[PDB]
Amino acid sequence: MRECISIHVGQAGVQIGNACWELYCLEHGIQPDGQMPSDKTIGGGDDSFNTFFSETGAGKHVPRAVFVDLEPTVIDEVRTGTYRQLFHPEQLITGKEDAANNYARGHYTIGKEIIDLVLDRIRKLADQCTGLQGFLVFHSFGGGTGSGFTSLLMERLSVDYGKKSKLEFSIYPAPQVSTAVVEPYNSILTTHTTLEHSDCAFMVDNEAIYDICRRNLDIERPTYTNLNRLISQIVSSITASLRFDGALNVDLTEFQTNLVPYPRIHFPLATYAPVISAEKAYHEQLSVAEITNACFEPANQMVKCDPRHGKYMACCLLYRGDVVPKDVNAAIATIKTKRSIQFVDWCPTGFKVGINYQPPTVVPGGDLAKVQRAVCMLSNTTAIAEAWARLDHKFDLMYAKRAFVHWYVGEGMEEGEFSEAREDMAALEKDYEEVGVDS
Amino acid sequence: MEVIELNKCTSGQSFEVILKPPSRDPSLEEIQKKLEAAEERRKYQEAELLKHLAE
Amino acid sequence: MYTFVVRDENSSVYAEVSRLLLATGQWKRLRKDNPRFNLMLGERNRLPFGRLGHEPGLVQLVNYYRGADKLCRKASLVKLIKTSPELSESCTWFPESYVIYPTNTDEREVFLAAYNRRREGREGNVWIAKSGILISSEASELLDFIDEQGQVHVIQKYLEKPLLLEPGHRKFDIRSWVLVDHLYNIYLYREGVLRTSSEPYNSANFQDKTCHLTNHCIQKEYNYGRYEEGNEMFFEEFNQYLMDALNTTLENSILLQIKHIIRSCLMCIEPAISTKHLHYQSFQLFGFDFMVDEELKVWLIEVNGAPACAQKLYAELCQGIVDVAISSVFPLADTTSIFIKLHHHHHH
Amino acid sequence: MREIVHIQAGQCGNQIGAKFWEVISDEHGIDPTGSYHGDSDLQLERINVYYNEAAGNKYVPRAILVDLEPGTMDSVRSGPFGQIFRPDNFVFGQSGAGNNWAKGHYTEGAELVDSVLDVVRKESESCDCLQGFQLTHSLGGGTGSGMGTLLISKIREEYPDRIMNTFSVVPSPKVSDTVVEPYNATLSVHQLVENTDETYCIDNEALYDICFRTLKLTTPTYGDLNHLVSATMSGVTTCLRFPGQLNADLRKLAVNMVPFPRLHFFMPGFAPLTSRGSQQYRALTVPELTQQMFDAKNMMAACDPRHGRYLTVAAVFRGRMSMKEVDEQMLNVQNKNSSYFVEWIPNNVKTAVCDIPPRGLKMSATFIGNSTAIQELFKRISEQFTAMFRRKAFLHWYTGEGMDEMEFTEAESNMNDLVSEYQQYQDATA
């Protein structure tokens, strides 16, 4: 049993973190006070759930989590919410004034003055670990802390734990819930700085999540609470294999091995099904064939893009619920005769498959119905580069007039850091294109 | 067409199916330098401001 | 008030379509880089599909199908026919064809094997090459022409016995215009055009090609205009000729086969390109080019993804595009069909 | 939370300031004694942004009242809310500046400004995390104009990294016949371009036309004008005073609104427009709010928006309503008018909803626009300025206080350059 540390950075990272840890407690039968009746070894264990949870003599299960925001408001919610006894004061780290949507201010100005305290608090958690695998880092691309501070942290994590794996979950910006017009800048900046330091990164476009909630959960105008509950189901599917007994993606190295042949192209596409409103009066349970098929519908993806026009390098299916292999294989045979699924010449056309028999837990009084079976698919396809092309274009539009640049230059950052980050992204869009098209 | 690596437990199972076969990070020292060059640039902008204002 | 942008200045067809849209009073043209449009008349190269369908509160629609190049490029077409079950290498209506890269998935071995197999029946052994064309009876005048050019080529069996119009002993090809709308309805415009040669057809002379190649241009450059205006015969006159000279109809002898080839091509790639479950929708105009042989057997030559129309026909077609491609998605304010819709569901 | 220090200077500044305090005090259930008496906790969550907490559960506005004459301050001391302000926070001289910016900036204002600065200092020091400063004043007089801009310059020196925000009332010959107002305004704008971060342009010409043409007031008073000003101020500071996501502090606001440091002058807008007392029986619909708040007739700066382009826009809807509908209506406004919004700042309109409506309305909307059409206001001031300056008329009032003509030529130049920067971005394409 090897431990994982979870780092949640910024409003997005922290609020998504709450949703995740809540879902985890429900999943493992841990109560808000931190007690788990079903856990037989008091004061320790090397169980699977212990990759995420340490134990005290008093029988309390505590997240290996650290929340850092540069202002107090959000983290003060955690400090005083329903889950307040779960977390050690020293795990919750606040600054006084935030990065004002400005990557430079989060990386250089406030970053410079808080990095050490953050690193030391993580070091505290790493010391409680027999064999630390590495880090899961949660943050937006768009806020100043989530972009600027995160990228700085990653640089520093690579110094202090160079051997360790780092997996990111990154919120990609969407106008229908964005709070700043400079998100494209922040997003390119953080991506250029973090690219080398991240072993595998799961992007979640807020727009995909917002539309899934409107269409499938029949929600008028989703709030963060809606989005975060949905995002937490997807994150939970992805990390279930770290937390429960199984033989697929059981360590963080294995995510890289299964999903990332080419280390720069490390952004797998997540697709999830089914998403079913709790209000739905009556609902026919969907078969394995149906939910597997829905994995190839752009409308169920965390990033809208069209995998039919690209190539796959890798593809995992993660089932939760009543599912057997004979059903999965038959589903796959059909789907493959029906759909356009091209892998790159140097990979086997195939699928790693993991089935956990517990179906998904839902937050009681949530918008999500209990279902008999669900699937999260993780594919590494070059189609996801569409997302970078969209962000790059918005960046080019603004940068050509130097709009808002003075806010960055004013924090110390140099104007050349812009064009350098941009060129990195240009070479990354070239990599995807080279890997995924011939003609 | 071909199942491999079948692994089962009480929690569930996992395996792989094949349909077709296939045809130097910054040092602590550098990070400190660029943080500080940045703060040198902030501090210089601000001291210019304070100059103009004194004028 | 709907909005559209225009990103291909050249397109004759789409110039006319904006004209029609503006002139309706209910559409407005924005500039190139304004993303807040309902309709993009797109560029021919590197059209940015990844950027479509991410504008909240705008239903967006474009006049290309992403992935449709696979039908429209000569080497792609050949791969596609060889490799789809639905069509197969036992497709009866596409000339035996081979992809030949220069040396300066190749199929030269497999080609020669089939050529050096056809020297035996001592059957006609004429072949043609494009990507700049070359017809020859000689294996290594062709392969020698290709290697001497940094462009990838198709080598395809040449139809030695075409159907010739009279008077004049003339060759032709047929162009059909096909509109595929956002629902994947396939529409054949009822007017096609014959593009005729003007110099008598030469059963044994391949250098001179005013007689072997029916492009409206390479004919304008050499007796041109003699039998009909601009070397363009329409369906009226061509039907009469079929009735008069051969006792048959265009409908029965030719159009059936044309409808079957169009439907087979487009049905084949529908899974790859349909916009049915997508965040943006497409439509697209294709031009299918056919050769008729002397048995009145129709053959597909090529598909053009950015066809131009024939002068006489612009007004009607463009109106058709506005009607079934655009106003089907964006209704106009309120108060014959020029298309044949291709659908067939045979049960077996 | 993050504290804002408020300074009001001169007759206009102190009238509109008082009026702001009345209005937001009522919005937060704080009564003239400093005692809270409301029924929500939305009212108290971010109270510290504008109020200090005294013992006895009292709220004192964090507000400094400045003038070179006593008049308007005896008058504010005895307004309805007068007893609410801290008394050592009234800073006043005796002789007044006679509508002369040189006196305000250089000679009499010079005398009093250190006393103001001490009060400001004292208010700063007791702040956990100061966001910065906001000033109300007119540009056409002598105290608000010349002293107020001297203050800004001094505050910027002591606090170079805090946000400086003004509410600057622009003069018009429809409201005032004092001849040198274009001189004071041009000198003031010069200072504002250098030393503020955001400036809200309240244009006396706009307020007067609204009152006359739309509110059907045949003889508007200042009180009528100020009623539109205080609705606006309440609107634009909503995001700072209530819980929310968008523009929730001064710095977040400035990064969303100011793409180039000099173009920080904003057109505010408001719906519905109302006159004092007279009654609002019908709530507007979300579509009406949306069409009205972008109407040229609802702008507090007399610029024609169709004459320019929006660089950035923040929109604030108040009262309980459908967020879904707000969202369609906002998208609809941009999609139906896409060419007024610069294509090279994608997604440049941001929207907030706050549940609490303003007193006497079920619902309103406030607009804040950084439009290139604001050049029109500067052009009007510049034309009035040049007609006089090319003959050096009335200059002796300025040089008699030690100013040089050069100082005038510089102000004029800086302002002509501002106007042409806006023109450059109105024509830039992508």
Ligand SMILES: CC[C@@H](C)[C@@H](NC(=O)[C@@H]1CCCCN1C)C(=O)N(C)[C@H](C[C@@H](OC(C)=O)c1nc(C(=O)N[C@@H](Cc2ccccc2)C[C@@H](C)C(=O)O)cs1)C(C)C
């Ligand atoms: C003798 C003529 C002036 C009264 C008049 N005219 C002019 O100034 C000239 C006249 C000919 C050339 C072009 N015009 C611009 C005017 O209507 N002015 C200056 C008003 C302002 C003025 O109007 C009136 C009718 O009294 C004033 N309003 C107030 C006022 O609002 N006072 C309130 C208290 C107060 C508020 C702010 C400032 C001072 C006092 C008292 C109450 C009743 C209220 O709230 O309405 C004082 S002087 C408007 C243009 C805005």
Ligand SMILES: Nc1nc2c(ncn2[C@@H]2O[C@H](COP(=O)(O)OP(=O)(O)OP(=O)(O)O)[C@@H](O)[C@H]2O)c(=O)[nH]1
């Ligand atoms: N899905 C989701 N997205 C969020 C959430 N909170 C913020 N975002 C998105 O993340 C971006 C804003 O970043 P924030 O995380 O709020 O910024 P921050 O890291 O707090 O940084 P500051 O600029 O210091 O406040 C925008 O795209 C928001 O839409 C959340 O709870 N869930």
Ligand SMILES: Nc1ncnc2c1ncn2[C@@H]1O[C@H](COP(=O)(O)OP(=O)(O)CP(=O)(O)O)[C@@H](O)[C@H]1O
């Ligand atoms: N296999 C074949 N047998 C007989 N004729 C052929 C042929 N392939 C091509 N042609 C002739 O060549 C002409 C043009 O060739 P092709 O259409 O392949 O090239 P192209 O695309 O540059 C011109 P277009 O776009 O108008 O069709 C046809 O009109 C036809 O006359």
Ligand SMILES: Nc1nc2c(ncn2[C@@H]2O[C@H](COP(=O)(O)OP(=O)(O)O)[C@@H](O)[C@H]2O)c(=O)[nH]1
């Ligand atoms: N809207 C409005 N304008 C005012 C008010 N008082 C004065 N003004 C205008 O302000 C300018 C004169 O400035 P004022 O504040 O009186 O002078 P100061 O005391 O030297 O700053 C002229 O344009 C007046 O019309 C007011 O209460 N409201």
Ligand SMILES: [Ca+2]
């Ligand atoms: Ca245990």
Ligand SMILES: [Mg+2]
């Ligand atoms: Mg934040």
Ligand SMILES: [Mg+2]
């Ligand atoms: Mg006065």
